[PDB]
Amino acid sequence: KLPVPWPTLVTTLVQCFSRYPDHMKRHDFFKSAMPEGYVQERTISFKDDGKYKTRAVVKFEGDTLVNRIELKGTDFKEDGNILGHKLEYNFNSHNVYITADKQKNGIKANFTVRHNVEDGSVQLADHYQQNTPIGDGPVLLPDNHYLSTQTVLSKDPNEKRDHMVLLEFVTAAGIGSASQGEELFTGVVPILVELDGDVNGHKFSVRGEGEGDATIGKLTLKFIST
Amino acid sequence: GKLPVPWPTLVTTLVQCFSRYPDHMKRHDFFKSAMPEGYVQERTISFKDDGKYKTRAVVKFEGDTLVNRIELKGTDFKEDGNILGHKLEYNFNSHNVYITADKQKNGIKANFTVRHNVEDGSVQLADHYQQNTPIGDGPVLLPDNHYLSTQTVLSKDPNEKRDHMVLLEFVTAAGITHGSQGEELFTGVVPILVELDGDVNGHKFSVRGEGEGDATIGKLTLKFISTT
């Protein structure tokens, strides 16, 4: 059983599947870094509580887009909203504000997730993010813009393990193929997610599998606490 | 063609019989108990600082299919407001809809506020006033106070020329921790047809939706298309 609520892991558990409208295709850093991929690092500060620090490698392995993550959580309160499992099983819509990080040839992002708490309060999770390409080839450095998200969380009635079924749609806003990497996302792409986590000493792992359809911005994934 | 109002404002109008009621709450599922005859769903939707929808719907089985047939009348909308000006974001937030019994007319009632995100970063409130009455004289379940918790995502079909909305939602009942033949009609996946006849500020339109619902898991999948 996960020592943290599933919704707190959603943002850590592949922005290359975002729908970039045609007029914005030149601003899609994430696909342009493929197939070699990018490193995505975040600090997630849960206000009045602890923080996650994450580092992920997102790249193709053959036909599969893989997101392999190491997560480290510290300074959490034993019966705060996170370790005390006080968060509703849902995930609100957010805007992910992206800016170029020119001299590191990557991007940064900032956004604040709002997790609904059982008692009607809200638990904020302030995200700071930086992505750096792994490969040597040129990438697309964007003008400032944002990604707007929508997500539904559910359970598989046949799954006895602790798990999360996720469906999300993400579209870019706020501004032929623009990169060769973009062409690797033309159809439905299988996804593998592997997370190794330690939060206040509670060790855990998550494996997710599913597929993404970047033309529509859609992700469908099932995650299992292994 | 293009609807005169934003799709998100029609989501609540466009089948609560597909809510997942947990086993211990099965004696609180009015919506399924009214089946298969059905129920009349009537709403006032008051958009803050703007117009209002009045809606009248018939929700019943047409043989195998669960059908939601609605008449909507929208009045007093500002031509440059958030609704007629199409200034609402294409999403739909999670809500808790509080259900109470309306014993005197053998149905339920609900008052809830939808918060529609506006393009300028603000919110457009839509206060909903709902009343549901069973269509027949048979027995129905009048529930204790509880709520429905919803999650919805809206999307588009990239090759659909017509104004349309792809919708997926999960809804589960909650708020009771204590523990009908219509219930049997939802044992598996049920096909759904939605037909809406609309008039907002004199702009007439129609919507047709098709999909299915699985009340055992609370899941609804529908594609809606403008048909006039």
TrEMBL record, chain A:
The keyword RNA-binding does not apply. Keywords: Chromophore, Luminescence, Photoprotein. The keyword Signal does not apply. Transmembrane segments: none annotated. It comes from the Eukaryota. GO terms for biological process: bioluminescence; generation of precursor metabolites and energy. Belongs to the GFP family. This is Green fluorescent protein. The lineage of its organism: Eukaryota, Metazoa, Cnidaria, Hydrozoa, Hydroidolina. The chain holds residues 52 to 229 of 251 of the full protein.
